[PDB]
């Protein structure tokens, strides 16, 4: 046999990116998982080169980011690629998860593949929170104060978790020095879960946009999907370069260019755009302990989805009512992000409470009811009795 099939290390490369049998009819939505591996490489490489010039003390953290922007050769390129590359990492991940919702990729036999991807999503939200606090701007101090005070509502162990998370009595010097050391480590745990993600993909393969079997017509990976991957890689780099070089501060807040101050409160405290829908779910529950449970249950409700889908057909391609309610869930997620960037005022309080209900009623009420109705309409439209 060939040397790429008999060598111990080259056989893993051959079985994954060269000779891997792919379904013939997959479209450009199946190219988002390849872009997520490129995003993780850009974040690790640009972050290691920036970490050679960074100081994590409470009186040196803000000025060392300014030292990177002014004194380091091409240091403004390193930071803008890193800050805008995190927003591009979350936009491709939202499109990757919504492809699996539309085409039924969560279903059996790919349940273990769906469950490992939920763990990856939680670790990525935690990584972006820890690195945002390392700038120590005015948005970094008050965003860490709001999140860490949520754990003081847990009964009998509230005040012990929050003091152990601070290293003191407030957000101080020990808080920032331990947030930077944890920020270096969690991207390497994400890289180990990506390997476990690809091992579960290998035993069953990919799905296709028709929802039926693909074992009748396969083509190999090399020279079809290697060169189809190159089309979306060059389009990704071109849109990212237009943000890094021509508009580098559009996706940020101006208050993060003020050094952090524990004695002055900003007028508005708002997260980045990719954390805004989960911030509006938290502010809609008036109780303090029930708000923290509900914000974490908005991520863990994706695990109940293999059990509430009652359909005998995989995917939304031939389903009329499932297609209509998919786009209700999509535009409800955009309205939750817009509500989370407003003030707590009439009528935005009631609008965020109804939209939080529609988020949870999709997974638990709407999907099992209309799956059963579509099963019976397919039956009585053909059988003559």
């Amino acid at each position: 046999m060939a040397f790429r099939k008999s060598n111990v290390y080259l056989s893993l490369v051959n079985s994954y990116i060269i000779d891997s049998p792919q379904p013939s009819s997959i479209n450009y939505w199946w190219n988002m998982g390849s872009l997520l591996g490129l995003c993780l490489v850009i974040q690790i490489v640009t972050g290691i080169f920036m970490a050679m010039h960074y100081s994590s003390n409470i009186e040196l953290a803000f000025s060392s980011v300014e030292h990177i922007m002014r004194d380091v050769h091409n240091g403004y390129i390193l930071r803008y690629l890193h800050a805008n590359g995190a927003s591009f990492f979350f936009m491709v991940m939202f499109m990757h998860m919504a492809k699996g919702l539309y085409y039924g990729s969560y279903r059996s036999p790919r349940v273990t593949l769906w469950n490992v991807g939920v763990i990856i999503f939680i670790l990525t939200i935690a990584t972006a929170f820890l690195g945002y606090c390392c700038v120590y701007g005015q948005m970094s101090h008050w965003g860490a104060t709001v999140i860490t005070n949520l754990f003081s509502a847990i009964p009998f162990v509230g005040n012990d978790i929050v003091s152990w998370l601070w290293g003191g009595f407030s957000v101080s010097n020990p808080t920032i020095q331990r947030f930077f050391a944890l920020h270096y480590l969690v991207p390497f745990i994400i890289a180990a879960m990506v390997i476990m993600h690809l091992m579960a993909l290998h035993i069953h393969g990919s799905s296709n946009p028709l929802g039926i079997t693909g074992n009748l017509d396969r083509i190999p990976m090399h020279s079809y999907f290697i060169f189809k991957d190159l089309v979306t890689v060059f389009l990704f780099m071109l849109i990212l370069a237009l943000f890094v070089f021509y508009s580098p501060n559009t996706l940020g807040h101006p208050d993060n260019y003020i050094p952090g101050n524990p004695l002055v409160t900003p007028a508005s405290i708002v997260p980045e755009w990719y954390l805004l829908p989960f911030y509006a779910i938290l502010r809609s529950i008036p109780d303090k302990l029930l708000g923290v449970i509900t914000m974490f249950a908005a991520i863990l409700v994706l695990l109940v989805l293999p059990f509430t889908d009652r359909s005998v057909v995989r995917g939304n391609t031939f389903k009329v009512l499932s297609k209509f309610f998919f786009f209700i869930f999509v535009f409800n997620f955009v309205l939750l992000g817009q509500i989370g960037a407003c003030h707590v005022e009439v009528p935005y309080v009631l609008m965020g409470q109804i939209a939080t209900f529609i988020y949870f009623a999709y997974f638990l009420i709407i999907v099992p009811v209309i799956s059963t109705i579509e099963n019976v309409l397919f039956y009585i439209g053909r059988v003559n009795k």
């Binding site: 049998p21 079997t213 074992n215 209509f324 786009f327 309205l335 005022e345 009439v346 935005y348």
Partner: protein, 93 residues
């Protein structure tokens, strides 16, 4: 090594579908074809056929959520103006 649990995909030669008999296929080399003969009719006629089949499943949910946001934004602007001061005191109790 030992074998593992059963799957639904195989490899080249034993992929795992039904048996095939009676189907014949034909192809032609890419070096013998004229380059890019779908740059005009596919971009105008075919993309219009794919667009208008799927545009009512997207624009009817999009118009519901845009009408809802626009009335809530215009009512908040009235409550904090000068003319909406006695309505602001009674919706805040």
């Amino acid at each position: 090594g030992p074998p593992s649990g059963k799957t639904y995909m195989g490899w080249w030669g034993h992929m795992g579908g039904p048996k095939q008999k009676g189907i014949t296929s034909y192809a032609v080399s890419p070096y013998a074809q004229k380059p890019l003969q779908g740059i005009f009719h596919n971009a105008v006629f075919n993309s219009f056929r794919r667009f208008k089949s799927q545009f009512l499943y997207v624009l009817i949910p999009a118009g519901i959520y845009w009408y809802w946001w626009k009335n809530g934004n215009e009512y908040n602007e009235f409550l904090y103006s000068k003319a909406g001061r006695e309505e602001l005191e009674r919706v805040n109790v």
